[model samples]
Target: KDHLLKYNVGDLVWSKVSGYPWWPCMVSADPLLHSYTKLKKSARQYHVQFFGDAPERAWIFEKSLVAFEGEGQFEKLCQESAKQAPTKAEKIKLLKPISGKLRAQWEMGIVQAEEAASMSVEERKAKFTFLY
Candidate 1:
């Protein structure tokens, strides 16, 4: 059975990019219809515009896209991914901000994650936890 498109144009999303964890992006177009193209037959793809210091646009497979929860959630994932990096340099690279605006958000996320880890059960429950 064919899969239906899970997102629509203009929807904010997170796209899995090579060498990086999920990056902020926005859906720029509808899923490519096989009947309308001459490209190799495969799963559907969507055009997405990445948000970073240097914005980029590309055709990403639908499976590589995920909904954007919030900056807190994004940062938490970023930290988790960075921990998996094999080297210090790579970990630093993963934690580095993609843009000036995101720099602060990234650091703030680190603090929040740390706080969450240190919180007692009751304290944690009282504070809003960003869904992982």
Candidate 2:
């Protein structure tokens, strides 16, 4: 709840992810709705809907988030809607990744193969390409 001091709900923030660049996202929901993350030091994780509705529903730490300036239509929509934010139940699920077992690896492989089969070239490339 106290993470609001660093950043507020609906603010545009930049988040860093492994294998990716700093991503711009709307603070669709805040720490008030969820439990604090396992990693310590008063860190609070907020649900972020990255720009363009990307598949990954991310929970970024409050301290790690950098405030972003410059407004767009997307920013306006979220900022305005922040006034009547969703109930805690509607927030993104803070789920854990599957364990790194052989079965898990195979399952993930199948998931990727299926998605690749379903996607057009552009979608596949957009969704899975590496960053520089």
Candidate 3:
């Protein structure tokens, strides 16, 4: 299955570890893994190093890994491990400004006019819009 060759090295991925849920890992080598055609077996397996030596390292079936896509999850996981969690007071400071009668459209929760105006056309259309 050449489609399994799509993954590239250095990519962040989810690698399975025995008796545990899949955890983030980094692909040490991509197609360098041995390809297989055994019945019910993955076409290939990637060699990955789990973050923070959670399982040290392992060889995982192609189906066992999912590409860690765009930002956030992996970024914070990799960088924020040493950082302390923000207190409630600090958390309140991180909230974005809200305006207008957002509650009028709430309960069922539709996007308010002020926010839709600031959103990209894509994000605006993705949510329930207040045309008013």
Candidate 4:
């Protein structure tokens, strides 16, 4: 239980085929809203973090496409749209530590606020900055 991936969409995972070495990856969803994955296997759809170019391509992958990289020592990707200040140029460190779901919920308010604003009125915003 401590090590097995629950197969959600935010764990650090790795996988190795008979011909491949350990490839680092991240857990993600399939194309169809009905399926979800926690392990690092290739599925019909996935949101993975490939070690090389880290490109995002989906579909045509089965369970053989990945291995698990469970919750490595980094923060998971999060999205938010709350009344926190502004988000045109924000960095991960500056942002609060939240899970993906929490972030999504937080963002709803921001989106609503933006929609409420008429085109005549401009809104302040920020962007994300990664640290070296």
TM-score to true structure, per model: 0.49, 0.40, 0.39, 0.30
Question: In candidate 3, what residue range of length 10 has the lowest lDDT sum?
Answer: 102-111
Q: How many Å off is the CA of 74 in candidate 1?
A: 1.9
Give all candidates' CA lDDT scores: 0.57, 0.46, 0.44, 0.35
Best by TM-score: 1
User: Predictions ranked by TM-score, top down?
Assistant: 1, 2, 3, 4
lDDT of 4 by residue, 13-129 (tens): 443233222344444444445334333444243444333322332331444343332333122322222223255444333344544653454344234323322222122111111
Model 2: residues with Cα > 4 Å off, grouped in runs: 1-4, 30-41, 53-55, 70-132
How big is the positional error of residue 53 in model 1, measured in Å on the Cα after superposition? 4.0
Cα RMSD for predicted model 1: 11.3
- Top of the candidates by lDDT: 1
RMSD per candidate (Å) reads 11.3, 17.3, 17.6, 17.6
Q: With candidate 1 superimposed using the best TM-score fit, by how many Å does residue 96's alpha carbon deviate from the native?
A: 8.6
Off by over 4 Å in 1: 1-3, 30-40, 75-132
